Structure 1
Amino acid sequence: MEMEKEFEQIDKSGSWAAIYQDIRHEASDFPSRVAKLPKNKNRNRYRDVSPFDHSRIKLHQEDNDYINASLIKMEEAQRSYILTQGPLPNTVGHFWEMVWEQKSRGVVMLNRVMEKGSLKCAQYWPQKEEKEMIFEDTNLKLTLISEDIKSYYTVRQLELENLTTQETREILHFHYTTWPDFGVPESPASFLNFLFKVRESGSLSPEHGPVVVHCSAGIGRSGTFCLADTCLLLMDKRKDPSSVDIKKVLLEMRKFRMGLIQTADQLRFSYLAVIEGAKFIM
């Protein structure tokens, strides 16, 4: 079926939970043996969210190459994304090591450091120009260059220096600051405006390594971001945009990381975002 009318048909019939449970039943199951090794327990935020072995990102280190991060490679859309958990106190250096080694231009953050009165990820970037951060375990330096605070999101320019080679690179930090502590946004308008800002920066384009996207677990809000982007790109590329099947695209993405889209409300929000986004594109 088309999307917008499939949408109203699920609303009128109130069957979002049944649609979402079908997706969960059909999703891929692949091994995640490296994630479950005992030496990696303090590298995982949640025991039930792990990268598959076949698609995990490897650090270029011979001691321990493990990080909780997956490469989602979308062949028809010609987009790649790295989805990862919010960094932990003992993985902030690994996180920036990955950004460096994978040649990413942009980092997309969809959570606040504290939500619901608890810590959802480490404070992994500097908040003042004159107070830079040094990660001694991976030999990197990170400096805040500039910061632009808007009503729904903040953009930061950062300098990442590899202290071993003295090479430097400019990294863009796109921080969506207004996702509600509970539920999903009422309108997708500000999320779509944010996605377009990331696109306009060049961070999603083939002349750079894959964008790094995270929330707390790296599967819920993060899944919404890449699902909406890929679906909109396919609607632009194909002769018949109504052929784009968001449930099929989601199942393809779940071949590369488990659990993408965590609730039926996130599924409905993803439909809403693609539907509204397709009207603005034209």
Structure 2
Amino acid sequence: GPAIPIKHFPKHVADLHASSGFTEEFEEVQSCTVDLGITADSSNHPDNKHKNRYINIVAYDHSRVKLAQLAEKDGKLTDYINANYVDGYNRPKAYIAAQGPLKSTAEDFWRMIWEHNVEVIVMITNLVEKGRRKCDQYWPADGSEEYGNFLVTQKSVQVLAYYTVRNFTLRNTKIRVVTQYHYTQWPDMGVPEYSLPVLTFVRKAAYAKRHAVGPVVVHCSAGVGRTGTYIVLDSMLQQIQHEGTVNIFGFLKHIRSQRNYLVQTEEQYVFIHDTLVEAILS
């Protein structure tokens, strides 16, 4: 879809509301991928059967984040984690989009952080919301934890009201800093919406990874809806800033080819537009 100059984008959005066109646009975004050369064999192999939080959320073979293989006595495949490399604005493979780890893949998660040279992590969920398990806690409550070969240490936590920042050290104990930005304002009643600190959150995250040679981890629960919502906002604040145009429709359609369901629902989709409208007005 077309590259909307900032100036025109407010009316562009107002239209689609008044128009009501958001629904159709999103149906096109959904049917655009239509499995085209796209497989998920690793995700469905029996060794990996327990590594998938949701059974219908899969990591497509071509973009999936490969782990190094290790030979265990059990013989089972060790190359697998439910996450995919996802492009950014002038930047192939800027993001890793990942499901939130399980108790049983927290070591795999860290080892991914390790092997793919990650320094920053973006967490867009609580462990629990409306009394449903979303994500299992994969960093140490207090001080240090070993996750197999991987030693993680909590060196500080800046708890703000809309979000928390946790700086660890990551070590491989068979012979680095990782900063986690974890948004925490998840309403118990209603659905998400409000701009200022969401943008701030994204702005401070965009800053902290602005120099990071590696990709950044984005993870929610399944690692598709919110994770996607963020990937887009992030990239579009970039493109906005480097060309003063904004291409949500075309950029999302692009990344749906790299991970299933990125930006999961219409509300998120809209959310993105409304939020960006606001971001500008300054």
Q: What's the TM-score, normalizing by structure 2?
A: 0.89
1:85-130 deviations in Å (ceiling 9; x for gaps): 010111000000000111111111000001121211111111212x
User: One-letter code of the match for 1:21?
Assistant: E
In structure 2, what is the equivalent of residue 18 of structure 1? 24
CA offset at residue 70 of structure 1?
Answer: 0.2
Are 1:234 and 2:232 an aligned pair? no
CA 1:214/1:142 → structure 2, altered by over 3 Å: closer, same or farther? Answer: same
Give 5+ residue unaligned stretches, structure 2: 71-76
In structure 1, what is the equivalent of residue 42 of structure 2? 34
1:36-63 deviations in Å (ceiling 9; x for gaps): 1111110001111111100000111234
CA 1:183/1:225 → structure 2, altered by over 3 Å: closer, same or farther? Answer: farther
Whole-angstrom CA distance in 1 between matches of 2:160 and 2:241: 29
In structure 2, what is the equivalent of residue 255 of structure 1? 257
In structure 2, what is the equivalent of residue 170 of structure 1? 177
In structure 2, what is the equivalent of residue 92 of structure 1? 106
1:174-227 deviations in Å (ceiling 9; x for gaps): 0000133576433221111001111222x243x421000100000001101110
* Alignment match of 2:62 (pick from 48, 54, 62): 54
Whole-angstrom CA distance in 2 between matches of 1:72 and 1:224: 13
In structure 1, what is the equivalent of residue 230 of structure 2? 225
CA 1:38/1:266 → structure 2, altered by over 3 Å: closer, same or farther? Answer: same
Are 1:199 and 2:206 an aligned pair? yes
Whole-angstrom CA distance in 2 between matches of 1:251 and 1:182: 31
User: One-letter code of the match for 1:81?
Assistant: Y
In structure 2, what is the equivalent of residue 123 of structure 1? 137
CA offset at residue 78 of structure 1?
Answer: 6.1
CA 1:182/1:27 → structure 2, altered by over 3 Å: closer, same or farther? Answer: farther
In structure 1, what is the equivalent of residue 154 of structure 2? 144
SS of structure 2 residue aligned to 1:4: helix
CA 1:92/1:79 → structure 2, altered by over 3 Å: closer, same or farther? Answer: closer
Structure 1 segments (4+ residues) deviating >6 Å: none
CA 1:183/1:70 → structure 2, altered by over 3 Å: closer, same or farther? Answer: farther
CA offset at residue 27 of structure 1?
Answer: 2.7
Q: Could you tell me the percent identity over the aligned residues?
A: 35
CA offset at residue 234 of structure 1?
Answer: 1.2
Give 5+ residue unaligned stretches, structure 1: none
SS of structure 1 residue aligned to 2:81: strand
Whole-angstrom CA distance in 2 between matches of 1:164 and 1:56: 26
SS of structure 2 residue aligned to 1:133: strand
Superposed CA RMSD? 1.8
CA 1:181/1:61 → structure 2, altered by over 3 Å: closer, same or farther? Answer: farther
SS of structure 1 residue aligned to 2:122: strand
1:204/1:210 contact within 8 Å kept: no
Q: How does 1:176-215 map to 2 (within 5 A)?
A: 176-181=183-188, 184-201=191-208, 203-205=209-211, 207-215=212-220
1:219-276 deviations in Å (ceiling 9; x for gaps): 00110111011112112222xx24x321001001111111011111100111122222
Q: What's the TM-score, normalizing by structure 1?
A: 0.89
How many residues get paired?
A: 268
